[PDB]
Write a protein that binds this ligand. Structure first.
Ligand SMILES: Nc1ncnc2c1ncn2[C@@H]1O[C@H](COP(=O)(O)OP(=O)(O)O)[C@@H](O)[C@H]1O
Ligand SMILES: Nc1ncnc2c1ncn2[C@@H]1O[C@H](COP(=O)(O)OP(=O)(O)O)[C@@H](O)[C@H]1O
Ligand SMILES: Nc1ncnc2c1ncn2[C@@H]1O[C@H](COP(=O)(O)OP(=O)(O)O)[C@@H](O)[C@H]1O
Ligand code: BEF
Ligand code: BEF
Ligand code: BEF
Ligand SMILES: [Mg+2]
Ligand SMILES: [Mg+2]
Ligand SMILES: [Mg+2]
Ligand SMILES: [Zn+2]
Ligand SMILES: [Zn+2]
Ligand SMILES: [Zn+2]
Ligand SMILES: [Zn+2]
Lengths: 337, 363, 369, 370, 248, 126
């Protein structure tokens, strides 16, 4: 939201990442890798505020000056943001083109010339290759920042120019404590939120304050009828909310916990639904369970990658295939190639 | 004054003469001999993976080609033209990023430009980079100027991957496949750089940095900058190990020995501990793959033990003795496919969990 | 083929080409519409410019032995070469078959040629009226009637001027929205009754080429073709058909309020009121009282303009809105210092005649402000 | 160091006399017959793979049409218009980048300028190269002139893929197709050219470059000039091989023979000595895959082996006799997969070694004992 | 915001600035790939202000004394900045207080304030562009050349208006051809003391140079049928022009 | 041999008679009965696939709507009104190819034409 939100565990990293700029040895580029809602956005914002501030205070930005006063108004003439338009999802060549053509001119306020790409994975590869020159060899006093959920999906070249700084999710107990201070409910839900979100406290907050949690509950209840009866089709309404990737991820997490329960493991992710875990283990055969988990992950990938795919057809075929697999006498697929 | 006199090693240590280039003797020799003997081709296509030197070799070629001191394989480096081309302010070396200039307007502009005389140098050279993403119309318009240009026009093409070139575009230009830099070459160049810049280091961290960057010197220097940013401006084994998050052979062998004996509970507890310490999962998978490779080598001929470390080689010898080759092959194949599917996994940790739990399939 | 030869001085060649440039070029849809036609007749050169509805012919006098013949040449390039050459240098023009050679001083040029592509009869009139309207007559007539006529209007016939010759006088009328113009010029010749509509663009072309207030002109007006012989040169245009409103039905509307007095004072007042006139509804309010006029304007900028004028009046108190632009064109084309103004109603046409003479009359339908 | 030499063999040794066009006997025969008999169509479409001579043949015919008069079958001596054609001075020779005239308005502009015939010649020739990228409306626009053009204007369209462009244009006047040059003809051309330039050549290098050239003299000449640059005005076998990067095919042959013979120690010896040779592991795998496909090929016909393979034809025959097809397919599948996952292996050498060791462990006859 | 201090301060007559901008404006790049070209170089040294503009096929240098001791400085002002600078200054008022800082330029003209940001970078030197050993010279009245080239430019090609100069002792000749296979040729009586030479120019830049040169007599310097031309005032050396010729 | 070189089959065999139109009888009968009865609309649009008959049916409709014999479903094909269209030049018929005419100026030029009466035919066909 307004200037986003600082996150308490982020303070160490920023300090390190500002030292390299205090000494003047700062690499112009930077590819911050951080989970969604982790808090990398606040880090990039605070960095840019320090960089473009005419008087950089020790570890702070200014205290008082116009140089970042224009930053707070979000109207600095050097500070550029590259985010896809609210009505679109792919960052076009045109915006990066405008930013890079306007970079060759001098710094308006006599300071740095800071750029920022809001999310690098959204960059079209044509835009990435238009931005390659600007990243590799920028003009003097030009800096960059980028944010990625993962770096491996980026273009082979763009990350090669940049430093791959990493944001480690906070320790499990600290994250649980912070979320408990923020949101109040049973710790099983909080552990499920953190482990589901791969440790991103911001993503756990989004899960709680977002409706999905209740919808998640819905799914659990639906499975509570499906697995004892072998009637999975009735899950359709639960798995279609334009959140098919996230809901399929929750389903795959449940199946992971069941397969863990087979090879009895001390820790599993879903701790709010142990009875569901036990039931899933009881009814389903391990080979069938792994084939079903593979199909769930495959469908989630197919939905996440290709936009414009029909969600209803995919999920319906998935549920029919699962129902087929629960019938004895079927040959299950195995990952290969 | 405050103009950031410091420059990143990835650009400060850019080659400036044909004697400063690390490796690729297979192309430096050809280029230098062509410069000297009097055979120069009007379109050069340097192709190779990231951070191997296509732009640098092309810029050195430009420096040599339009030097005022004849046309020599050794640019003087003190003249004007050398200095501007090094700085990139020369009129006759024009940098075209093919991602931008792909519309027919810009290609028509370029074809209009090629018809005139030079300004300062003998040759007006278009360094077109990332050519492999010119729109088909751009390439078809560019065919004529790439085939039979005027006397003072030469083209230098830089591409990250030759595959996306229209094959006809390949055929009219002189291909130079820049080989990926070997780990020894990268480590020696890093040693020379770090000794030159009076920066303390030790050879072990150099080997780790060379291994991490899959044959890309620019990547090696990027990791060098990351390793000196953290760790009080020095390169050390602990620093690079923490930066990469890499793990010793003991833990990966614990994983493979628990998984080869179907100790699922132990495997999952080890994964939990590894997550608690927060390792890089791809690193875990590469270590497992390496251990399985060594086990296979030991199985094949007893001579090739695990002797690079030889710390817990007792476990490796025992595991080789007690496991048929088929089972190790299946474990390697499973872990490898799982490694291929980390990006597609919803989470890295859960992707590795899928792969390991699937490896647990055999009894 | 036939070959042509010319040694033509530049200055006496520019004015014909410069004049005929009207129906030349201007997005030529065909390779033949954008070119000029040259022909040799006895001791004259005819330059024909065509745009499929307006044909402009210029007669250059020949003073040297010139080979007869006709051709079609790119009009723009011919004009540019004839203009750029040094002053007073005779140009030597020859037809090299498919090419057109032209030389001058130390310069040579060649042109692409078209043998015969615009040579039909090109014209056929009826000539109901053949008044020898002298120069000064239609000069003031057309400058007083053109105004700003119909553009994009659905009523096609309102585009062209209405000519009506009767008795010894010709009345020229023009309707466009609120505004309407008419001039009754006393030709003085025993002339038959005739009514015709001429295209607006033809009117502007005739007025522009007209110039030079000295020579009587021959005007042959039919039902589909109108020809005007302005001294040396000839122009011809098509004719718009009927459905035009009768000026005898829109001019006389039984005016009952009469007013007079200065025209340039009204011009200044109208210009100063146009500053604060409604920018969306162009027009201001006119309060009419006995021997007094008041002009008021209230633009959306919340700025009020008011002026008082001494205009004679013996009728009733009135409040009439009007477009400032239309009436300002009326005043400017009236070329007079005093005007007469007849009011009928706030929704009935308001007449404005010249106080100098009845020869010039106008109508503006009032505005509702 | 400095010089004024070079001509780029590609830019130097183009045909200009109908005697340098190698191969493509069909199209040269047709063109000679038509010119001698005076039957000339209104549209010519040369198709074929890249680097074959379609542009050069188009220039050949264009200068054969307008060369100091005389309807010759291309031989034309002291022909001025021809010499400006080969000198880049356009004389009724209009090359058009169709990509710059994709829109129908541009091709309409092309149409309206068809009447300008008499320009120091008899015919004005249009070379709309890469014609398959025209827009449909542009195709229709040029079709009207295609069916009935002026006598003095000849169309010569060059394209790579005739499938793309519309059928009506395909059928209009003619469609000639130039096959890819055989490696034998490439060998002849490279040998002749390097003979013309007083430069020695080892026939092994000529065969290497001919096979490395995908039946296209322009690829062959680019590679050959690269070979000349790599050496010092001399092409040699070891320099050529280090330029291509291809290892000893006999090294790969010994490696696959060892894999068949199930001696892992010899396999390790070969792989490490190949590592010391500084060869690309991907190259090693693809060469072994080529050898495996060849040893499957000899299962159906003895003629599978090319002329060069006479060096190792006997070992091919022995392996073909020894190994049944199922084992060849097993090895092919194993190594093809191994190449598929080579990018994800911890090291390219590591991955290739593991793939070979797996082909050894899953040996159909004598697998690795447990 | 606190104003930026200036390292280059001077004041100019409106005539001098107008002459400089009119002399070099047509000679600067539009959206050209080389970023440092799309602008105008304002060099200052001694008491002389010099102005340089290039697009890779053209070069305008205009030098005018100022009488004020000035440091050796360089600066590039982009397309828009100089266009609206020329628009901004038109009157006869003396105040032209020009301030050049590290990143932006400001010219004060009475009640109007000029503002723009400089194109970061270093301009190529013009002296390296002007030929150093011109061994061929030509002279003619400025208006004769300008009218001749304007007349000959009528029937040239549309997008690129190439013309051919044949320069010899007997006379000067210029010819032009177009895609319509139309020929134009003309002769001028310039005084030459050399042999035949053939060069190929673009009539657009030549016409622009002649139009904005604004003198009486003009001198051309030439070296080779491919090298650059150096057109200058035959009566002064305050402005020089170069037109890199055209391949045929 | 040189057949059709004078007149391409498409041009040579442009249907001058409804019996010359093979296919599209569903449209042919509708047009014939509409002409005979008088249910003539102010605008007619036809949709087809390239060489389907659209220009042929439009020109046949022009013949049948402005023939010298009157509004007839069976044009004679020999009268002056019919032969003017058959040759290609009919004053009151304006045939326009929209591929080269996408501007508003020329469309407005025809817009002005929509008002005047036909010079020779009964109705103006655009
Ligand atoms: N062959 C090489 N020798 C020395 N340094 C190299 C070499 N290749 C790459 N580098 C290093 O990588 C950096 C970027 O190299 P570059 O030539 O731009 O690679 P690219 O081909 O991908 O554009 C250089 O600044 C240099 O430090
Ligand atoms: N049939 C051929 N005869 C002689 N040289 C050829 C032939 N084909 C290709 N070449 C060589 O290749 C060069 C370029 O050939 P080109 O005709 O452009 O091939 P493309 O069909 O791909 O355009 C020529 O200069 C010539 O040296
Ligand atoms: N239904 C049809 N009956 C007879 N001839 C036809 C028919 N449709 C097309 N043709 C033939 O094709 C030629 C052109 O037909 P046309 O009606 O102009 O096609 P379009 O729909 O594309 O304008 C005609 O001269 C005629 O020979
Ligand atoms: F980073 Be390189 F130009 F591939
Ligand atoms: F035209 Be070829 F493909 F080089
Ligand atoms: F091809 Be048709 F005339 F639409
Ligand atoms: Mg690069
Ligand atoms: Mg080609
Ligand atoms: Mg049609
Ligand atoms: Zn501040
Ligand atoms: Zn040098
Ligand atoms: Zn010849
Ligand atoms: Zn009839």
């Amino acid at each position: 939201g307004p200037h986003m939100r600082w996150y308490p565990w982020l303070r160490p990293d920023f300090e390190k990442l500002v030292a390299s700029y205090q000494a003047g040895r700062g690499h112009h580029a930077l590819l911050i890798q951080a989970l969604p809602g982790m808090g990398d956005d606040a880090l990039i914002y605070a960095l840019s505020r320090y960089l473009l501030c005419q008087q950089p205070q020790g570890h702070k930005s200014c205290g008082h000056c116009r140089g970042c006063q224009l930053m707070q108004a979000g109207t600095h003439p050097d500070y550029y943001t590259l985010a896809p338009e609210k009505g679109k999802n792919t960052l076009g060549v045109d915006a990066v083109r405008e930013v890079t053509e306007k970079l060759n001119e001098h710094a308006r306020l006599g300071g740095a010339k800071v750029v920022w790409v809001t999310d690098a994975a959204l960059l079209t590869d044509a835009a990435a290759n238009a931005l390659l020159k600007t990243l590799e060899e920028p003009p003097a006093e030009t800096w960059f920042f980028l944010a990625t959920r993962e770096p491996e999906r980026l273009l082979a070249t763009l990350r090669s120019r940049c430093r791959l700084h990493y944001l480690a999710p906070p320790p499990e107990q600290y994250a649980v404590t912070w979320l408990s201070r923020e949101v109040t409910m049973s710790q099983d839900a909080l552990l499920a939120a953190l482990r589901l979100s791969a440790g991103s406290p911001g993503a756990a907050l989004a899960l709680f304050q977002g409706d999905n949690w209740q919808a998640r509950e819905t799914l659990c209840q639906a499975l509570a009828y499906s697995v004892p009866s072998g009637d999975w089709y009735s899950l359709l309404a639960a798995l279609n909310h334009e959140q098919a990737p996230a809901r399929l991820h929750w389903l795959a997490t449940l199946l992971m916990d069941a397969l863990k329960r087979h090879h009895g493991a001390a820790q599993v992710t879903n701790v709010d639904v142990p009875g569901l875990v036990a039931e899933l283990a009881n009814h389903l055969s391990p080979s069938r369970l792994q084939a079903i988990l593979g199909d769930v992950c495959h469908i989630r990938e197919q939905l996440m990658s290709v936009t414009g795919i029909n969600r209803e057809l995919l999920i319906t075929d998935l549920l029919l295939r699962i129902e087929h697999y629960l019938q004895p006498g079927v040959v299950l697929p195995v990952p290969h190639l | 004054g405050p103009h950031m006199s410091y420059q990143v090693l990835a650009r400060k240590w850019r080659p400036q003469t044909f004697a400063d280039v690390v490796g690729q003797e297979h192309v430096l020799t050809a280029l230098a001999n062509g410069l000297s003997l009097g055979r120069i081709h009007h379109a050069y296509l340097f192709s190779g993976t990231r951070g191997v030197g296509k732009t640098s070799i092309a810029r050195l070629l430009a420096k040599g080609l339009n030097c005022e001191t004849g046309i020599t394989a050794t640019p003087c480096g003190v003249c004007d033209n050398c200095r501007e081309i090094e700085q990139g302010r020369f009129v006759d070396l024009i940098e075209i990023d093919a991602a931008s200039r792909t519309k027919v307007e810009d290609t028509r502009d370029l074809l209009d430009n090629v018809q005139y005389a030079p300004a300062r140098g003998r040759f007006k050279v278009y360094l077109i980079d990332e050519v492999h993403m010119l729109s088909r119309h751009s390439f078809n318009a560019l065919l004529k100027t790439l085939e039979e240009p005027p006397e003072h026009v030469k083209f230098l093409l830089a591409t990250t991957d030759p595959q996306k070139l229209p094959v006809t575009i390949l055929s009219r230009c002189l291909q130079f496949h820049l080989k990926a830099l070997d780990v020894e070459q990268i480590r020696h160049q890093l040693e020379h750089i770090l000794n030159e810049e009076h920066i303390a280091h030790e050879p072990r961290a150099l080997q780790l940095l060379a291994r991490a960057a899959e044959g890309s010197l620019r990547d090696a220097l990027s990791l060098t900058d990351q390793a000196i940013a953290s760790g009080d401006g020095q390169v050390s084994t602990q620093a690079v190990s923490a930066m990469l998050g890499t793990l010793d052979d003991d833990q990966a062998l614990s994983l493979v020995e628990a998984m080869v004996e179907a100790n699922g509970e132990r495997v999952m507890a080890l994964i939990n501990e590894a997550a608690a310490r927060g390792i890089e999962w791809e690193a875990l998978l590469v270590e497992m793959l390496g251990l399985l490779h060594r086990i296979a080598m030991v199985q094949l001929s007893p001579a090739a033990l695990g002797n690079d470390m030889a710390a817990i080689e007792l476990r490796m010898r025992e595991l080789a003795r007690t496991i048929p080759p088929t089972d190790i092959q299946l474990y390697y194949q499973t872990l490898l496919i799982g490694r291929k599917e980390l990006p597609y996994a919803p989470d890295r940790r859960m992707g590795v969990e899928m792969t390991l739990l699937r490896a647990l399939a055999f009894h | 083929g036939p070959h042509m030869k010319f040694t033509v001085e530049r200055e006496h060649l520019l004015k014909p080409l410069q004049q005929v440039s009207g129906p030349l070029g201007g997005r030529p849809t065909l390779p033949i519409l954008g070119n000029l036609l040259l022909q040799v007749a006895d001791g004259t050169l005819s330059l024909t410019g065509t745009d499929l509805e307006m044909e402009m012919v210029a007669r250059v006098a020949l003073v040297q032995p010139h080979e007869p013949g006709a051709t079609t040449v790119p009009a723009r390039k011919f004009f540019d070469i004839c203009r750029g050459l040094p002053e007073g240098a005779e140009i030597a023009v020859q037809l090299e078959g498919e090419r057109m050679l032209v030389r001058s001083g130390r310069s040579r040029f060649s042109l692409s040629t078209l043998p015969a592509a615009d040579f039909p009869n090109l014209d056929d009139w009826q000539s109901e009226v053949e008044f020898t309207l002298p120069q000064a007559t239609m000069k003031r007539l057309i400058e007083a009637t053109q105004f700003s006529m119909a553009h994009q209007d659905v009523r096609y016939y309102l585009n062209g001027m209405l000519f009506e010759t009767e008795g010894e006088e010709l009345r020229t009328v023009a309707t466009d929205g609120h505004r309407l113009a008419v001039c009754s010029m006393p030709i003085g010749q025993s002339l038959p009754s005739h009514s015709v509509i001429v295209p607006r663009k033809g009117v502007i072309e005739l007025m522009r080429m007209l110039d030079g207030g000295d020579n009587p002109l021959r005007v042959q007006i039919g039902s589909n073709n109108i020809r005007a012989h302005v001294g040396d040169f000839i122009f011809t245009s098509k004719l718009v058909d009927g459905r035009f409103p009768d000026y005898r039905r829109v001019l006389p509307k039984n005016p009952d309020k009469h007013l007079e007095a200065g025209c340039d004072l009204l011009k200044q007042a109208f210009a100063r009121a146009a500053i604060l006139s409604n920018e969306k509804f162009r027009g201001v309010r006119l309060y009419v009282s006995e021997n007094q006029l008041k002009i008021t304007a209230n633009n959306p900028e919340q700025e009020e303009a008011e002026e008082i004028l001494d205009v004679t009046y013996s009728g009733a108190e009135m409040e009439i809105g009007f477009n400032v632009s239309y009436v300002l064109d009326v005043l400017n084309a009236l070329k007079c210092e005093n005007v007469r103004m007849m009011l009928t109603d706030s929704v009935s046409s308001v007449q404005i005649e010249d106080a100098a003479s009845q020869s010039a009359a106008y109508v503006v339908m009032p505005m509702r402000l």
